[PDB]
Amino acid sequence: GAGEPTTLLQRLRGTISKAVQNKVEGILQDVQKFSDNDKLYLYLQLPSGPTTGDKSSEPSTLSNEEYM
Protein backbone atom coordinates (compact mmCIF):
# COMPACT_ATOMS: atom_id res chain seq x y z
CA GLY A 1 0.00 0.00 0.00
CA ALA A 2 2.75 2.44 -0.94
CA GLY A 3 5.14 3.97 1.57
CA GLU A 4 4.65 6.49 4.37
CA PRO A 5 7.90 8.18 5.48
CA THR A 6 7.91 10.42 8.55
CA THR A 7 4.77 11.20 10.57
CA LEU A 8 1.48 12.20 8.94
CA LEU A 9 1.13 15.54 10.73
CA GLN A 10 4.71 16.39 9.77
CA ARG A 11 4.56 14.92 6.26
CA LEU A 12 1.73 17.39 5.64
CA ARG A 13 2.92 20.17 7.94
CA GLY A 14 5.74 20.82 5.48
CA THR A 15 3.28 21.46 2.66
CA ILE A 16 -0.22 20.50 1.55
CA SER A 17 -0.42 17.27 -0.46
CA LYS A 18 -1.59 17.28 -4.08
CA ALA A 19 -3.94 14.36 -3.47
CA VAL A 20 -5.65 16.28 -0.66
CA GLN A 21 -6.15 19.43 -2.74
CA ASN A 22 -7.55 17.26 -5.53
CA LYS A 23 -10.32 15.78 -3.40
CA VAL A 24 -11.24 19.26 -2.15
CA GLU A 25 -11.76 20.51 -5.70
CA GLY A 26 -14.01 17.54 -6.42
CA ILE A 27 -16.38 18.32 -3.57
CA LEU A 28 -16.58 21.98 -4.60
CA GLN A 29 -17.77 21.00 -8.08
CA ASP A 30 -20.12 18.47 -6.47
CA VAL A 31 -22.29 20.92 -4.53
CA GLN A 32 -21.93 23.56 -7.24
CA LYS A 33 -23.18 20.95 -9.71
CA PHE A 34 -26.66 21.77 -8.40
CA SER A 35 -28.33 24.87 -6.97
CA ASP A 36 -28.15 25.46 -3.21
CA ASN A 37 -31.57 26.95 -2.43
CA ASP A 38 -33.40 24.58 -4.78
CA LYS A 39 -31.73 21.53 -3.22
CA LEU A 40 -32.17 23.05 0.25
CA TYR A 41 -35.96 22.83 0.03
CA LEU A 42 -35.82 19.54 -1.87
CA TYR A 43 -33.79 17.90 0.90
CA LEU A 44 -35.87 19.28 3.76
CA GLN A 45 -38.87 17.83 1.93
CA LEU A 46 -37.70 14.46 3.25
CA PRO A 47 -39.12 13.18 6.57
CA SER A 48 -36.74 14.24 9.34
CA GLY A 49 -38.71 16.58 11.58
CA PRO A 50 -37.95 20.02 10.11
CA THR A 51 -39.41 21.61 13.24
CA THR A 52 -36.37 21.28 15.51
CA GLY A 53 -37.64 22.99 18.64
CA ASP A 54 -39.57 25.44 16.47
CA LYS A 55 -36.40 26.82 14.89
CA SER A 56 -34.72 26.82 18.31
CA SER A 57 -37.10 28.99 20.34
CA GLU A 58 -34.77 29.22 23.33
CA PRO A 59 -35.19 32.11 25.81
CA SER A 60 -32.68 34.97 25.88
CA THR A 61 -33.51 38.48 27.09
CA LEU A 62 -30.36 40.07 28.51
CA SER A 63 -30.10 40.15 32.30
CA ASN A 64 -27.76 42.96 33.36
CA GLU A 65 -28.13 45.53 36.14
CA GLU A 66 -25.63 47.83 37.86
CA TYR A 67 -26.82 50.97 39.65
CA MET A 68 -28.69 50.63 42.94
Place this chain on the structure above:
Amino acid sequence: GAGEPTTLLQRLRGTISKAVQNKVEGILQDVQKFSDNDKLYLYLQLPSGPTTGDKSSEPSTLSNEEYM
Protein backbone atom coordinates in the same frame (compact mmCIF):
# COMPACT_ATOMS: atom_id res chain seq x y z
CA GLY B 1 -16.45 3.78 -19.44
CA ALA B 2 -19.68 3.09 -21.30
CA GLY B 3 -23.41 3.68 -20.95
CA GLU B 4 -25.74 6.68 -20.87
CA PRO B 5 -26.66 7.69 -17.30
CA THR B 6 -28.83 10.65 -16.29
CA THR B 7 -27.86 14.10 -15.03
CA LEU B 8 -26.66 14.96 -11.52
CA LEU B 9 -29.33 17.56 -10.76
CA GLN B 10 -31.99 15.11 -11.92
CA ARG B 11 -30.79 11.99 -10.10
CA LEU B 12 -30.33 14.25 -7.08
CA ARG B 13 -33.68 16.05 -7.28
CA GLY B 14 -35.27 12.61 -7.05
CA THR B 15 -32.99 11.33 -4.30
CA ILE B 16 -29.58 11.90 -2.72
CA SER B 17 -26.64 10.47 -4.65
CA LYS B 18 -24.66 7.66 -3.02
CA ALA B 19 -21.47 9.12 -4.47
CA VAL B 20 -22.20 12.52 -2.93
CA GLN B 21 -22.75 11.18 0.58
CA ASN B 22 -19.99 8.57 0.40
CA LYS B 23 -17.57 11.16 -0.99
CA VAL B 24 -18.32 13.56 1.86
CA GLU B 25 -17.45 10.85 4.38
CA GLY B 26 -14.32 10.02 2.41
CA ILE B 27 -12.63 13.41 2.63
CA LEU B 28 -13.99 13.98 6.13
CA GLN B 29 -12.10 10.92 7.37
CA ASP B 30 -9.04 11.86 5.32
CA VAL B 31 -8.44 15.01 7.36
CA GLN B 32 -9.73 13.45 10.58
CA LYS B 33 -6.92 10.92 10.14
CA PHE B 34 -4.69 13.43 11.92
CA SER B 35 -5.07 16.25 14.46
CA ASP B 36 -7.98 18.50 13.51
CA ASN B 37 -6.75 21.43 15.59
CA ASP B 38 -3.04 21.33 14.75
CA LYS B 39 -3.95 21.06 11.07
CA LEU B 40 -6.76 23.61 11.33
CA TYR B 41 -4.14 26.24 12.17
CA LEU B 42 -1.44 24.93 9.84
CA TYR B 43 -4.02 25.24 7.06
CA LEU B 44 -6.42 28.10 7.80
CA GLN B 45 -3.39 29.93 9.18
CA LEU B 46 -0.80 28.64 6.71
CA PRO B 47 2.61 30.37 6.91
CA SER B 48 2.49 30.94 3.16
CA GLY B 49 5.77 29.93 1.55
CA PRO B 50 7.66 31.86 -1.15
CA THR B 51 4.64 33.03 -3.14
CA THR B 52 4.99 36.80 -2.83
CA GLY B 53 1.24 37.10 -3.30
CA ASP B 54 1.04 34.97 -6.43
CA LYS B 55 3.88 36.96 -7.98
CA SER B 56 2.25 40.29 -7.10
CA SER B 57 -1.35 39.49 -8.02
CA GLU B 58 -2.62 42.90 -6.92
CA PRO B 59 -6.40 42.30 -6.86
CA SER B 60 -8.97 44.93 -7.85
CA THR B 61 -12.46 43.76 -8.78
CA LEU B 62 -12.01 39.99 -8.98
CA SER B 63 -14.38 39.19 -6.12
CA ASN B 64 -15.28 41.43 -3.17
CA GLU B 65 -18.16 43.73 -4.11
CA GLU B 66 -20.68 44.25 -6.91
CA TYR B 67 -24.38 44.41 -6.02
CA MET B 68 -26.68 42.82 -3.45
Place this chain on the structure above:
Amino acid sequence: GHGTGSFGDRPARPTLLEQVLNQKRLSLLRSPEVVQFLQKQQQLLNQQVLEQRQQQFPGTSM
Protein backbone atom coordinates in the same frame (compact mmCIF):
# COMPACT_ATOMS: atom_id res chain seq x y z
CA GLY C 1 -11.42 22.67 25.09
CA HIS C 2 -11.47 25.62 22.69
CA GLY C 3 -8.86 27.71 20.90
CA THR C 4 -8.07 31.04 22.55
CA GLY C 5 -9.37 34.28 21.07
CA SER C 6 -6.78 35.05 18.39
CA PHE C 7 -7.61 37.77 15.86
CA GLY C 8 -6.31 37.00 12.39
CA ASP C 9 -8.37 35.57 9.54
CA ARG C 10 -11.85 36.79 8.61
CA PRO C 11 -15.15 35.43 7.22
CA ALA C 12 -14.41 36.00 3.53
CA ARG C 13 -12.24 35.07 0.55
CA PRO C 14 -13.62 31.69 -0.60
CA THR C 15 -11.04 29.03 -1.44
CA LEU C 16 -10.70 25.27 -1.95
CA LEU C 17 -8.66 24.70 1.21
CA GLU C 18 -10.85 27.01 3.29
CA GLN C 19 -13.77 25.00 1.90
CA VAL C 20 -12.81 21.50 3.05
CA LEU C 21 -11.49 22.97 6.30
CA ASN C 22 -14.37 25.27 7.22
CA GLN C 23 -16.70 22.50 6.04
CA LYS C 24 -15.43 19.93 8.55
CA ARG C 25 -15.61 22.54 11.31
CA LEU C 26 -19.34 23.05 10.72
CA SER C 27 -19.74 19.34 9.99
CA LEU C 28 -19.15 18.40 13.63
CA LEU C 29 -20.09 14.76 13.04
CA ARG C 30 -20.57 13.92 9.36
CA SER C 31 -23.62 15.67 7.91
CA PRO C 32 -23.25 16.12 4.12
CA GLU C 33 -26.56 17.99 3.82
CA VAL C 34 -25.58 20.61 6.40
CA VAL C 35 -21.92 20.96 5.41
CA GLN C 36 -23.19 21.37 1.85
CA PHE C 37 -25.80 24.12 2.23
CA LEU C 38 -23.80 25.78 5.02
CA GLN C 39 -20.65 25.82 2.89
CA LYS C 40 -22.53 27.59 0.10
CA GLN C 41 -24.33 29.96 2.46
CA GLN C 42 -21.02 30.94 4.06
CA GLN C 43 -19.41 31.64 0.69
CA LEU C 44 -22.33 33.90 -0.22
CA LEU C 45 -22.32 36.04 2.92
CA ASN C 46 -18.52 36.01 2.65
CA GLN C 47 -18.43 37.80 -0.70
CA GLN C 48 -21.15 40.21 0.45
CA VAL C 49 -19.20 41.52 3.43
CA LEU C 50 -15.79 43.18 3.13
CA GLU C 51 -16.03 46.31 0.98
CA GLN C 52 -13.49 47.53 -1.58
CA ARG C 53 -9.90 48.40 -0.66
CA GLN C 54 -8.34 51.86 -0.37
CA GLN C 55 -5.05 53.64 0.31
CA GLN C 56 -5.30 54.92 3.89
CA PHE C 57 -2.03 56.71 4.66
CA PRO C 58 -2.35 58.49 8.03
CA GLY C 59 0.42 60.25 9.93
CA THR C 60 -0.14 61.80 13.35
CA SER C 61 0.48 61.31 17.07
CA MET C 62 3.23 59.06 18.42
